[PDB]
Design a protein around this ligand. Structure first.
Ligand code: ZDC
Ligand code: CA
Ligand code: CA
Ligand code: CA
Length: 114
């Protein structure tokens, strides 16, 4: 199935944060209105926070996460979790290789803010 795609409430602020756990340099693209709105990059095997940003979910609310390592797209896994009918997490893991730990870039989207 498609992974890394989340429908947020439209025109709404959200946080997006990426962590790295791989020998390979991660490039994380966050898309709003179907175009890259933020790019994070780094190289860490100790969960470095390679980027964090506040974005707006855009006209449709559709937010997409894509991850690449040396120009090759990583395989994604994702889910959305809601606590007390109010607090939202959109979660992405990604795999750049063969060990299937899916932590090579980890992305956490959260809303509402403020
Ligand atoms: C290459 O070594 C594979 C790569 O980096 C490792 C250190 C480990 O984090 C693995 O999950 C990642 O795919
Ligand atoms: Ca891996
Ligand atoms: Ca890893
Ligand atoms: Ca608050």
């Amino acid at each position: 199935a498609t992974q890394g795609v989340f429908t947020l409430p439209a025109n709404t602020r959200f946080g997006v944060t990426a962590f790295a756990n791989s020998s390979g340099t991660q490039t994380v693209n966050v898309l709003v209105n179907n175009e890259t709105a933020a790019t994070f990059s780094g190289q860490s095997t100790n969960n470095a926070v390679i980027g964090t940003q506040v974005l707006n979910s855009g006209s449709s609310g559709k937010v997409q996460v894509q991850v690449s390592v040396n120009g090759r797209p990583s395989d994604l896994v994702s889910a959305q979790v809601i606590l007390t009918n109010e607090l939202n997490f959109a979660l992405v893991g990604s795999e750049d290789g063969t060990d299937n730990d899916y932590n090579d870039a980890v992305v956490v989207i959260n809303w509402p803010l403020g």
